[PDB]
Scaffold this active site. Structure first.
Site, short mmCIF file in Angstrom:
data_model
loop_
_atom_site.label_atom_id
_atom_site.label_comp_id
_atom_site.label_asym_id
_atom_site.label_seq_id
_atom_site.Cartn_x
_atom_site.Cartn_y
_atom_site.Cartn_z
N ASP A 25 6.89 6.62 -78.64
CA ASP A 25 6.92 5.58 -79.51
C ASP A 25 7.17 4.36 -78.86
OD1 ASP A 25 7.14 3.85 -81.57
OD2 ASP A 25 8.38 5.07 -82.99
N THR A 26 5.99 3.41 -78.41
CA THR A 26 6.59 2.26 -77.82
C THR A 26 7.15 1.04 -78.49
OG1 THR A 26 4.02 1.44 -77.97
CG2 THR A 26 4.66 2.60 -76.03
N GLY A 27 6.72 1.25 -79.92
CA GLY A 27 7.34 0.49 -80.91
C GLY A 27 8.84 0.57 -80.96
C1 LIG Z 1 6.98 7.55 -88.19
C2 LIG Z 1 7.06 6.93 -86.90
C3 LIG Z 1 7.60 5.49 -86.82
C4 LIG Z 1 8.87 5.39 -87.53
C5 LIG Z 1 10.10 6.01 -86.43
C6 LIG Z 1 6.78 4.63 -87.77
N1 LIG Z 1 7.10 3.03 -87.25
C7 LIG Z 1 6.49 2.57 -86.11
C8 LIG Z 1 7.68 2.30 -84.97
O1 LIG Z 1 7.04 2.23 -83.74
C9 LIG Z 1 8.78 1.15 -85.67
C10 LIG Z 1 7.95 -0.21 -85.35
C11 LIG Z 1 9.03 -1.17 -85.92
C12 LIG Z 1 9.94 -1.78 -84.72
C13 LIG Z 1 10.58 -2.98 -85.49
C14 LIG Z 1 11.10 -2.98 -86.41
C15 LIG Z 1 10.33 -2.37 -87.48
C16 LIG Z 1 9.35 -1.29 -87.02
N2 LIG Z 1 9.78 1.35 -84.65
C17 LIG Z 1 10.99 1.76 -85.20
O2 LIG Z 1 11.46 2.24 -86.07
O3 LIG Z 1 12.05 1.69 -84.17
C18 LIG Z 1 13.22 1.83 -84.47
C19 LIG Z 1 13.83 2.91 -83.37
O4 LIG Z 1 14.16 1.94 -82.39
C20 LIG Z 1 14.55 0.75 -82.77
O5 LIG Z 1 13.70 -0.55 -82.24
C21 LIG Z 1 12.90 -1.12 -83.16
C22 LIG Z 1 13.48 -0.65 -84.55
C23 LIG Z 1 14.11 0.88 -84.51
S1 LIG Z 1 6.85 2.26 -88.63
O6 LIG Z 1 6.72 0.77 -88.02
O7 LIG Z 1 7.68 2.66 -89.47
C24 LIG Z 1 5.17 2.31 -89.10
C25 LIG Z 1 3.98 1.83 -88.51
C26 LIG Z 1 2.77 2.09 -88.92
C27 LIG Z 1 2.58 2.82 -89.92
C28 LIG Z 1 3.45 3.54 -90.34
C29 LIG Z 1 4.77 3.33 -89.94
O8 LIG Z 1 3.03 4.28 -91.25
C30 LIG Z 1 1.60 4.57 -91.28
O9 LIG Z 1 1.41 3.51 -90.20
#
Ligand SMILES: CCC(CC)CN(C[C@@H](O)[C@H](Cc1ccccc1)NC(=O)O[C@H]1CO[C@H]2OCC[C@H]21)S(=O)(=O)c1ccc2c(c1)OCO2
Lengths: 99, 99
Positions: A25-27
């Site tokens: 999960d690069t995000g």
């Molecule tokens: C189900 C898998 C993920 C959740 C785990 C999905 N996320 C994408 C993530 O990459 C988000 C992307 C994200 C990034 C920042 C803020 C909100 C969302 N990252 C995230 O939650 O990271 C958390 C863990 O590390 C921390 O650093 C970033 C936030 C914390 S999501 O943003 O909720 C997301 C994106 C597109 C989608 C979706 C959900 O459902 C369908 O399409």
């Protein structure tokens, strides 16, 4: 490996001796696993995502083998929707995005 | 290009006539952009992440340029804290994970 993205980038990991599936999960800044037991000390922490904040347990310096590659680092445990490998460990295994 | 993951993989995108910074996010099935008043038909959706769900507007066949590469597809618009480029568009720009 090279992993394309037409499907979710799911890989097998080994942690605390047990096999699990986790999403690369690069995000995600941090690595967050669903509820599980890990040995040793942990700290309460909170993290935020798309839908708000959750409480997690922060375990430091935890070994984790990710698709055959070794990392040792911080693992957060709590109510994430799915196990996620975040950048703190992706960097350790030499993962990059390429286009 | 190759993008390392020491920092958030933010890139410049162009959509609906605006330039924005957005995460290249292998953990995101869908692309989710911060609130913006795009023209056209849309459908309601809920998407879930850490913290729970948010309500978004689903717009289809929207052109979007990502780091100089053209894409066109579905974009979800809603109160996300960060613009997120998901796998539906990452595939279109030839993006892979590599380690
Ligand atoms: C189900 C898998 C993920 C959740 C785990 C999905 N996320 C994408 C993530 O990459 C988000 C992307 C994200 C990034 C920042 C803020 C909100 C969302 N990252 C995230 O939650 O990271 C958390 C863990 O590390 C921390 O650093 C970033 C936030 C914390 S999501 O943003 O909720 C997301 C994106 C597109 C989608 C979706 C959900 O459902 C369908 O399409």
């Amino acid at each position: 490996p090279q992993i394309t993205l037409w499907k979710r980038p799911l890989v097998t990991i080994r942690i605390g001796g047990q096999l699990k599936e986790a999403l690369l999960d690069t995000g995600a800044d941090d690595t967050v696993l669903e509820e599980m037991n890990l040995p040793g000390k942990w700290k309460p922490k909170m993290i935020g995502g798309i839908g708000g904040f959750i409480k997690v347990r922060q375990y430091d310096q935890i070994p984790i083998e990710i698709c055959g590659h070794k990392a040792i680092g911080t693992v957060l445990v709590g109510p994430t929707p799915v196990n996620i490998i975040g950048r703190n460990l992706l960097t350790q295994i030499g993962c990059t995005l390429n286009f």
